[PDB]
Design a protein around this ligand. Structure first.
Ligand SMILES: NC(=O)c1ccc[n+]([C@@H]2O[C@H](COP(=O)([O-])OP(=O)(O)OC[C@H]3O[C@@H](n4cnc5c(N)ncnc54)[C@H](O)[C@@H]3O)[C@@H](O)[C@H]2O)c1
Lengths: 498, 498, 498, 498
């Protein structure tokens, strides 16, 4: 399995130290193997980080904060600007590494790095706008103001699916806001974590700044638990399951810390009878099949109107038959493999429980005979009452259910514990005003004639209910990475009444 | 113990139903006695709310939300405007009831109701500004927007010290934001809870609105626990101890709900050698003695500079000797009684543990022989290392400690788990920039030449660390009472690439 | 005439001093007669202000500013709160005076005073929100901030149509922003000017504030020219014709002053074939007939679709036949008289020039034989090419032109020099996105399925092109009444390189 | 002269077409000579633009707007991102060209281009933030919103001193805001105008966009007058004298257009007795001598405290004696030549009128015998009453006047017609609160312990009084380049009362 030469340009070797602390690479933890989901073959080896490595790096990361906080915000924005340009120079290579290690199709991965690049460009302008307020006081010779200050150290625990995009949105904002970043990437994604850190480390070194500003570790739940329990980390940004999310939240809340939660999503698309069937079918395909259904924003529930029901799914199966399943690096591939053999096993056992709950498999449902973790994109006719519908299967399974009124459609959409993304395909404005109103969708993302997956830097990305409540990317999200202080200065010689 | 006639104008009788649900007064719970802290005599009786009453009122409160959410925000602001005017008509009476039942001196109480009145006036203007955003999209024929919507039902659990001000700041914002309010007042403050509810109920009835919009209950931890566990309440605003705060937070976080925490404060005043000693002494007195030290913002720690140390405290004791201790309703009273006989017992046992930890009582420390819960205002010379300093005694005890450098002063101020309010008395601007900077105070409120207690409607009131993180009154605090939705409307016929 | 008595309740007599200069009433100018447009009979007499009176009042108004600017903004907001309550106590009487003196129907006038009261409620909250900004500096130990400060004296020149609403929007903002107000009301509306000033003067006196904070004068263009040329007045808010607007602007621009312009509006309503004809007809009637077409937002142009053309206007004439023309104080009156006999003469000569340009009068066009200034509501079939269309006639004349496509409709709407208000009546979502887009309406107010006249205090009211550019009421309009200063404080010992 | 070659690297030749109209280079106007102020020798020739060229380019620029306004704002921001990178590649060369053609020292010019590059980095983030608002309506089933739209074509008339920085601030904002830019550079700076346009044209061509988006012309007042009178240009951004500013304003106001005015500045530095004399002397030198006093922010007035008066100016003359006067391209040069021989003649005749008004020349005042336009840096002891003080001389002349109290100092600072920048050198916190307060400086820029010239892209740069009122760079300046529309959509079936 060569190259090799491709990994060397990303700064990777056969065996790699998986701990970036304190400006240098180390690792006294176990030696893990990085596998490609396309053939289940070794890309390289990673010497994981131990708690010993974590503590050594954490002592320096905390110490580096003093220096970093003192740097003016526009000057911090200039470091982030150079991070974006560093990523631009390796865009093509990082995209390939994301596809090779994670399993997502080449366009996605280039686009993932492109999302981080677009975020750096925004963070430069944002550095000039981390504004405070001068509030009028009700007392004479009193200056009242709202003051923002860095938190210190921001902990970032990321998932396998966006092995650098989640860090990108968090680190760009955290760094620009004067915070140091302690990153713990996915255990199955160590090479992307190293290559991403080497780009950041490059910029920090080029500007004579301590490498401890961007500390990173490769490992399992051990280092993750250490971050959640660390009193030196005021903010922990978690990205993963609702199961692990609550666990992290509980530990962080106990120590009076704050945490940004970006949890599981059971996203639904509602198709009204008056919808653009061509637009709706195309949208449903790319929302459900995209990243082999391993996206937080992946459409898992299809709420179909009775009038269009049959005609919609027969022309959806017709499109599902045309999905090219292959190597994510090969041109024309639409669906790649599932990240691990474990997820392939989970998908197959899920199909069995779906059948148990009365689910009728319209298309797919079977595994594909290959060296990699390949499965068929599945469409399931099921009742909304079935427990598997309220679950969250991280594979290409789409549950389709019939509805009569818009009131019953919203009832189904809001019934699930998760509240990340939702969509309606309709032409009538009365429905659009209902959908976006108080009695509409209870999600963080509410879309009209656009799928659940289409999300950009401009607006604050995040979910409600079981998806946490945390917000990323644009808007006023920066305020989560800083501390608000209400200040009042008395500059008058006037003494209080005796 | 008459009048009586004063209570009748506030709508109170000898025995009162303590449950306002569903637009009517009830109560199937136990009969509690409301005592005056000045003589420990019965004012009136309150028939508490049971879980049965809570459930009946909660079913209607949840149902009323549909109607309330549909009312335009400026029209909701008009209801709040009339609430302020209703309070203005009973300002004099409510102030007396706050003094009589809670124990705070007449000026405070009138001022407390005045704070609610000023909040209504702000909430009217705010109703016209619950603005969303139209974000530029990166895709042609796409409308991107940030949409705000009511949460539904806001739960408000209040403490004894501000028996209506805490509700006032919460309810004004919650109601204007389209939410219904379920209030559970202090168990020792039921009469203020009833009288406050009768004013709100008056306005709601006058406008043909369901009374269930403002549901209120009198009771113990039972009704409070019910609110924290209620899945129908997306936001729980808690005001009380850090002990109970964490308990409420834990229960609310488990059910994927949000909670606004306004917890305990161990507030400190730092006096620099170059300070206006006249201003600093006056400020320290009113910050420490005010409301018999039963304020969340009460100065409990005095961090004194060695150069001014002796000269400051001898002239502080000289002022402490001049504190008039009497009936809070009597003119000229500066210090009233502690809210309950239990708090008087806690104060006295605290003095004993303070002596154990090497605390040298400079002034007071003893109880006053009276029918009411009167104690002497205390000044204690103590080392910052003592455990009682990190505690929170809800009485008039001031711990004084010597410092040499501004660096050791900030070290002491930030050492405590609580982070609500802090102050510095200085004339040099280099210290002011350090104090308000990243290496300064870690509190939510950071004041210069003004005590820890002086807080107005204009700025977002709240604390950091063990004080939670929740914000009240002005600024962008309204966003906590609503849900953010990132919306994208595709209005173009353009189909995604095949 | 008697009543009389009703005038005494508003603080008016048979002969009134028309100059509120230096906290007291005076007037060395000519004696003018206030006439009722319903019968052309004398209500009372007003002793106008001379330039001598103006100068004496202007010296004190400028001097009072020192005191007023020193008052904290929330405390200034409390004065404007009290002004609203003072107006509430005389709501019924002011509405009657406005109707009697100006000629507008009783609902309007009562509604107009209510518009001012609503602005007072918003201004209280706004006083707490005149915020500055703390911008991050790119240099270490540098504090960068945006600072707002009062301008000093705000000059308000008002028109006859809104003899107190225009002042209300301006004065509420100006006063809260720390500015003194010098008011010059319309020469045909002095009694409203006096009665409005007496309410303000009442509040200012009750709070021991100099009356010079609110200076007001009754007179012609003489006092208006004096304001425009006065170097002591940094901001002149003008409300009137485009002819006088440019004159005021040119005198103010010459002396490096700023002016708020709220000029003429030749507002159009576009009716699409798919519109709710019942809604559109009702809307067109009240937009065109309302205030006898003497509103700045009055619909003067009806852009009708060919498919609905005939059917729309025959059912519009059917409705125009039902318009009750009578005493504005009499119940059921829909159309009252024109403000002066001069405006009645202008309307009649206009009808003649309309006939000259090929205008075919569908309904009305004639004067009504009575003692008052009554005219018939007119509908005119005309080509958009006609010059009279591009002009502004301040009477009930509606021009109606046929169109085929949306491009043609927008072409007509944008063709006029004025750009105040515009409306479309359609059900199509595409038309709305085009109408609100870059290629849509070029007006300050762009409405969908609502007439040109419906405007509230929540959003910034103002017009583009020949309507000036000035904004009133809500949003960020306050910034016009203050001066922005970009401040940078260097608090570091660092010296520049030698 | 040769180099030559260096010019070819910037896209310049011996003779250059000076009209970038309709995506290609032309010019039917006269042939002008570009001279170097260091020796008065020809760099190259420029074939100016005629009115014929202007009209041809203006027809296409107006036509290109349709395409440009349709491009999404984040996508427009990407073009401005690329413009910054294009400038980065030629940073070294442009700085040299600016120095060679304008006469400013090499650090400035390299610094000036860097100011543009910095603005490009901010404009990318700003493209994602040109937000509208969703205002709560007071009527049910009504959507109220604030909508921003491009103006169309922005006219930019620039001065000689910042031959590309002024365009940079304007064009970055204008382009991101969806407007086309028509640029008219200073007649004495055509080569900088061409080289700057070639960089923009490069990016526009690389992205298959019409070159007409960025139209530029070389010429005198002829093309400038054409822009001011052009009805196709809604916004004219003028940068020059107060004399030409008023002329442009009056022509633009007449046609109901808007204009951004960045006029003359007679900036003052106030030195208090308690100031850091080392900091104040260094600051005064670089503020007054910088760019040979040919900056809009150049310190022209020194307001000195009587206690420090003599000691300050003797140590200022001592520093003025050390000013290196030479070739701006030569290392170590602190003062270069004046832009033209005409400005050298104006400086010398000014010295004569200064002597007439009782001005006593402390240092300099004489011309330097060389081929270039070199003059001595001048210090003048003068009374504030002298008329020359209130004027603006565009050379290195510093007027110095004695003061006793802060009232007297502010009186002098505010006495001049111009209100751009102002500074105080003090250590007292009281003076700073007075200086930044309502009774302080009446300028747009108010600095403490930092000179009048130090201005960055974070805050809105602009002046008050005779400096216009227009704002550039950061803050909410973008709103000037777009049109605000207050929109209300009625989506309810409710009909108005018959
Ligand atoms: N803005 C603020 O931060 C703020 C304001 C006022 C008071 N306080 C804090 O209040 C404390 C003193 O007030 P207190 O003695 O009334 O507080 P407390 O914590 O004992 O109880 C306050 C309220 O919570 C209820 N409650 C108690 N335990 C509960 C539980 N487990 N679940 C649900 N409800 C429960 C009580 O019935 C009461 O209504 C101080 O620590 C003070 O700092 C804070």
């Amino acid at each position: 399995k060569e190259e090799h030469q491709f990994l060397a340009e990303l700064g990777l070797a056969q065996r790699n130290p998986g701990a970036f602390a304190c400006g240098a690479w180390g690792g006294s933890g176990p030696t893990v193997t990085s596998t490609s989901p396309t053939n289940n073959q070794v890309i390289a080896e990673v010497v994981e980080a131990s708690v010993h490595d974590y503590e050594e790096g954490m002592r320096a990361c905390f110490d580096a904060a003093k220096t970093w906080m003192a740097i003016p915000a526009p000057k911090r924005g200039e470091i982030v600007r150079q991070i974006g340009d560093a990523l631009r120079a390796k865009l093509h290579h990082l995209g390939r590494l994301v596809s090779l290690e994670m399993g997502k199709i080449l366009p996605e991965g280039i686009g993932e790095v492109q999302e981080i690049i677009d975020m750096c460009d925004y963070a430069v302008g944002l550095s000039r706008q981390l504004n405070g307020s001068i509030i009028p006081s009700e007392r004479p010779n009193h200056m009242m103001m709202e003051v923002w200050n860095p938190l210190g150290v921001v902990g970032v625990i990321t998932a396998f699916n966006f092995p650098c995009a989640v860090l990108g949105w968090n680190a760009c904002i955290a760094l620009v806001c004067g915070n140091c970043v302690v990153w713990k990437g996915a255990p199955t994604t160590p090479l992307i974590t190293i290559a991403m850190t080497k780009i950041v480390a490059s910029v920090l070194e080029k500007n004579n700044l301590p490498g401890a500003i961007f500390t990173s570790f490769c490992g399992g739940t051990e280092i993750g638990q250490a971050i959640a329990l660390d009193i030196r980390i005021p903010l922990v940004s978690f990205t993963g399951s609702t199961r692990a999310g609550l666990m992290v939240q509980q530990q962080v809340s106990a120590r009076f810390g704050k945490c940004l939660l970006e949890l599981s999503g059971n996203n639904a698309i509602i198709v009204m009878d008056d919808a653009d069937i061509q637009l709706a079918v195309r949208s449903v395909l790319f929302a459900a099949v995209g990243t082999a259904g391993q996206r937080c924003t992946t459409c898992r529930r299809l709420i179909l109107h009775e009038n269009i029901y049959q005609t919609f799914l027969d022309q959806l199966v017709e499109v599902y038959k045309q999905v090219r399943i292959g190597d994510p690096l090969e041109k024309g591939t639409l669906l790649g493999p599932l990240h691990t053999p474990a997820s392939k096993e989970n998908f197959l056992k899920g199909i069995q429980t779906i059948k148990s709950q009365g689910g009728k498999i319209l298309f797919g449902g079977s595994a594909i005979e290959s060296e990699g973790n390949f499965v068929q994109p599945t469409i399931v006719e099921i009742t909304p009452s079935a427990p598997v519908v309220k679950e969250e299967l991280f594979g290409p399974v789409l549950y389709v259910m019939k509805f009569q009124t818009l009131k019953e459609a919203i009832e189904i959409n809001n019934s699930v514990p998760q509240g990340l993304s939702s969509s309606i395909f309709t032409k009538r404005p009365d429905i659009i005003f209902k959908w976006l109103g108080p009695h509409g969708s209870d999600c963080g993302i509410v879309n009209v004639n656009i799928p659940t997956n289409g999300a950009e830097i401009g607006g604050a990305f995040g979910g409600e209910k079981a998806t946490g409540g945390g917000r990323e990317a644009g808007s006023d999200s920066w305020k989560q990475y800083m501390r608000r202080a209400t200040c009042t200065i008395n500059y008058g010689s006037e003494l209080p009444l005796a």
